Amino acid sequence: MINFDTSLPTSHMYLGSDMEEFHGRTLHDDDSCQVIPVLPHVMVMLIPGQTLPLQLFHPQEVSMVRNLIQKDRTFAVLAYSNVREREAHFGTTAEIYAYREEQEYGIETVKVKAIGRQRFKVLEIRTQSDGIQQAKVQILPERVLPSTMSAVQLQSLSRRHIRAFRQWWQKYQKRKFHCASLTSWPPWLYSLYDAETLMERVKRQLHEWDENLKDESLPTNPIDFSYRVAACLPIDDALRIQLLKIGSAIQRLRCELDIMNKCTSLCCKQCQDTEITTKNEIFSLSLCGPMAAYVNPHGYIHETLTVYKACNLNLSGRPSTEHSWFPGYAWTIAQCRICGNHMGWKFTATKKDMSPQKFWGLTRSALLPR
Amino acid sequence: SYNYVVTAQKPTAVNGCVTGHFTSAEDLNLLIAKNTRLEIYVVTAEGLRPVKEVGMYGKIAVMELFRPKGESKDLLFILTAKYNACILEYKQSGESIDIITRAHGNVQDRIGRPSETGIIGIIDPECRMIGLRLYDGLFKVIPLKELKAFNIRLEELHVIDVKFLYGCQAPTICFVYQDPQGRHVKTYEVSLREKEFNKGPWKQENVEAEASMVIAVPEPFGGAIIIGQESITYHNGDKYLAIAPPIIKQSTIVCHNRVDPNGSRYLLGDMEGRLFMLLLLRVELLGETSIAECLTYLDNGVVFVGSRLGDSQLVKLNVDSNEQGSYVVAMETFTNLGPIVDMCVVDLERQGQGQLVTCSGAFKEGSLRIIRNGIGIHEHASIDLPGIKGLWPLRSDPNRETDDTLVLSFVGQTRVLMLNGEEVEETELMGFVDDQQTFFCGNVAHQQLIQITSASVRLVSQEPKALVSEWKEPQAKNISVASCNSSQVVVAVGRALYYLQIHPQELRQISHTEMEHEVACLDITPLGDSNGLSPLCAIGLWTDISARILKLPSFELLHKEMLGGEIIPRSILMTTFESSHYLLCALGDGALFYFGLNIETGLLSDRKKVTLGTQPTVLRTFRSLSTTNVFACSDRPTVIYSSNHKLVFSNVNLKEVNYMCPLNSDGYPDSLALANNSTLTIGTIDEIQKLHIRTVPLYESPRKICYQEVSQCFGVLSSRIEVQDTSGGTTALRPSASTQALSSSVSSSKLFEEVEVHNLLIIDQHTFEVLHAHQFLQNEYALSLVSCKLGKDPNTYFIVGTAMVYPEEAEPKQGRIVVFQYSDGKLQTVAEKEVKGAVYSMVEFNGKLLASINSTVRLYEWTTEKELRTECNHYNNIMALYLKTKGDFILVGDLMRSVLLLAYKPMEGNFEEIARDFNPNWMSAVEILDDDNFLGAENAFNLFVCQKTTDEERQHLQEVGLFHLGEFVNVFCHGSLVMTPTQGSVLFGTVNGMIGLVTSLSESWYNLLLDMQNRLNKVIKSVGKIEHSFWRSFHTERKTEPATGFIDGDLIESFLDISRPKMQEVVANLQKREATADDLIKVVEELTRIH
């Protein structure tokens, strides 16, 4: 069993404690048009509810956020379809929740912790002289649908409220979707569209990853739940945008289950056929899932996946604890044995009593679920 | 695209029913809710008295009667699904009946989540308030003009059921609620003066884990009766009484009713149709009924069973059990088509005449329903007598009340038939002539008989049969036209008319006149409270083409209508429908004119023309179910009846009828003698209504239906529930269609507690008998069914798409596509193709099979080796539930409205994604309208229509039609129940048994009718005063947008029903081009002909 504190990674301690906390929440009306600034050195895709850690040092970026605190506190994170030609049709708003200004080495620096809020549709990208871009965006509403049976049942059967759990779920299907007999589809088909059902199917995989998971930590709402899960699936950029376009929590859960089931092996994106790890080696060392976004000392965001065993990897150099994202663990650079692609790191415990004693931190940009 | 939607058949299913004194405080009333309809009745004790039927602009959710303090009768509260609240009072003054709104308002909250256990509408016993549970965590209160409402923060979020407690100083509500600890019953006191809740009279007593309903019991008992799965408990503070009867374990109790007003007996009903008696605690099983949605005790012993899954009932609760042991006996059955889960249009009987065969009901109430437009005749005798020119019934015995003689007329001859019970025999009536053609004969005044021939008027006595009197024209001329009642005779001799009176042994000539032109037709039917003596004579004339109302005996002209044309009036008739007097006049071209007639003045008003046939129409009056009707004999035989003081014309299902008369004999009672070109047929008439419904009970669930012409039979997918027996299999619950098959078969496996058993039924298109039943594999769920020809093969195959369903599996991993051939009265399995998923849909795609396997869409080629071969695949990322096609254009559908259009490239042999749309909402049905449009059913009982230079424009579909139907459509079908202004015809079947029709309109015709709708809504008074625009507004829990690209046919059709000055108001300045009321009458009439 694991004795590492799963809460520790989510707090980004490497970013330093003693940060100015902000409580106040900003939310834009559905379908409403907004003009939000864009951070020039952010190239990651942010899912709503996801924590984005930043370390900004470029004067124009520092001034941008410094001014952003004085107002809205929200910026735009673009989901690039082509990161080279900087093309994006969708994105997510990031609201700063923790902030800290420092001054060192002749420069003014700022460290932030933001959270994904609202998905948007890009309407136009205007550029300012300082390098910071502004984005005319249209807020995409979250589409909540009622029970599949809500409409068809306007009757007496309405007042029938929702191992060995197996029989409860069968009694649940038989009861909740009894009025399917009035329709042209079976109860087993309506289950494939039931939020509670689809969630319990995902919760099954989440528990295979976090063996010490307590259901109280998981969000009750399928809106918050679908998004939490979306942000921890090690998938390619093309599939991630497709997931971000999804408006329904049901369509999202159904999608995530397809990804979770069809998934088997995770290879090196560069040489494509070199297998690095498998679905069975994935595990949650953080409460926000097996995969999460972290910043290196130069502000580059690495979305890293925690796995117990990795295969064609070569380590170089000696372990380091500097800027470690998992306190108590030391990192050592890992590259693909075949091509030399930087795959992530090997994390090793600094104390004999720690569990896991070793794991692998793989960046999703290096992986390909092919 | 602009569409038109009209109701072919109103909803049949019962949503709710109540008893009280709504009309008068004397009459016991039964109010039935059929969704958008309200049927009001009086308990006849010897039947059911239909008083009024009112339509509403909403779906009924709540319906409960109440009498607040001093009132002449009862006030009715109704709450719609769109949260329209209203109090209705009954108002009657003579033949005029009107429902009156007392208070109205919309109770919907700006925010809040609609509760899981539905809308709960309770009323305080002292009529102090209205309690509404629409949203969880709030309790809305309406103290019973604008229906003022307020909320109270209800701490317990999950409320199962709630009722207002009887006999309380301060109003109290008792509710069953569930929390993570368990399910407990609680009490709260509702204060009006403080607008808040305060602690209830008794403690939160713990109830059953599956406690479902609260039954508020009146004084001297008080408190509540909580009903669960296994237990029935009673709570009254310190008073407790817990019972667990085994008889209620099989099925959950879903409905109840109060039998004794004090609260000593209660009716209980389960999901399996069992009826129980809760005596005050003891429970006794009474018997079996239809699966009751609602129950109502009325009068003594009689009970109303309101069924939504099957036919509604009237049953008698006898004090003594029969031989079988049932205290329940079925009295009357009421046709319910709902739910329509699938249907098809088939030209059964006659080609061009479409019939609609549906998969109706569920479980033991499962049936097939055949819906055919027109009234039918039930033949009891058929005789070869060609060229009949007339039919008249007679009573040869004055002592007898029944007809025993039938008199036939032929070219220059007369034959007489006698009815010796069921035996028809050729005879000769003494006094009557056989060598002359008869124009009239019948029983007349002073126990006599008359016979008007081309030569004379003959009067014959009945004891004995002999000629007592005879009348002739003075110059021995021939009688041209003739009319006769019981006391009077009016005969025409070219232009001349003669008025005679039937006296004892005398035919007295009273008066005579000369007409302006030749006489074409005559009528002297006595109308109103006239004791067989008519003061009026109706006459049609040649050359001038005029319908004239003449006074008797003077022959004075009272009215003269100029019918217009070169076509002479052939038949004329004075009649009475629903106490209103009318004049009917039929022309030689098959055209019928119908006016209202004033008995005193003679004035013909409200001229209406209706085209019946191609041949001259003959009008004969007949009696059916103690109601006067008119049979219109032509190549399109028609019954002319009255419905809401407006004349209705329903067709008869007969090739042609030339002449007819009503025959009431000892052998043929309350019958109709009909004559065509070759034969005379004696028979009984069906129900005088627009549509006819034949019921084929299956006693199991019908799911899918298709038709094979080459086999003269239907393919029906059905399922039956079987229980797990103490053996290696399962046993049936009752005999059903799939068990009682003529020839049976089972699937042979080749692939690797209540059970659902699936079957492919074979039913004959005439007899409707199960010729064959093919039982599917264990755990095999049959989904799709199609009867077509594939590839080069000339044999039609019944193809079924299945799914292997297991509890552990979420999405089926296996499935089959089974090809069957129906030959020699037995299904022969041709091909068995195993697929890696569920076969939700299948469609014949230009000689190929297009079938869905979960997310994938497959195209199969039918080889000479007689086995399907995989051609091309399309992987969609969305479940292929819906699969519709037209040419090389394919529609792929999801339950969440995710539609994507595919195109098969013949030379490439691959699928191309034309367009896509992803806007989440629940979708129940979809159909392709044309090359560029498609129709569908959306969440919250709505209908929609989607249409088709730049790629980012062409690859996207646009929502052109939005309409709130108020119904849940399960099936769309191309076809018509009828034998141009509009384009196409798509029928639709709903959960409530409602059938509808969707047709296309032109851009300007849409605007004309839309403008008309806005004007009609200013004239028409809405029940409960709901705005039509609001009712039709595309509604979801999120958005409510006004209806677009759709015309409410039901509303448009009520223009022909409004008063003539109100029609003038609607058409005034309507229109640019000007529009006459006469122009708009023709347009609206033309639209009624589509259904």
Ligand SMILES: O=C1CC[C@H](N2C(=O)c3ccccc3C2=O)C(=O)N1
């Ligand atoms: O836990 C970790 C893994 C290593 C990671 N890391 C980097 O990605 C990096 C890039 C360049 C210079 C220094 C670093 C460093 O410490 C880091 O910051 N934390």
Ligand SMILES: [Zn+2]
């Ligand atoms: Zn590599």
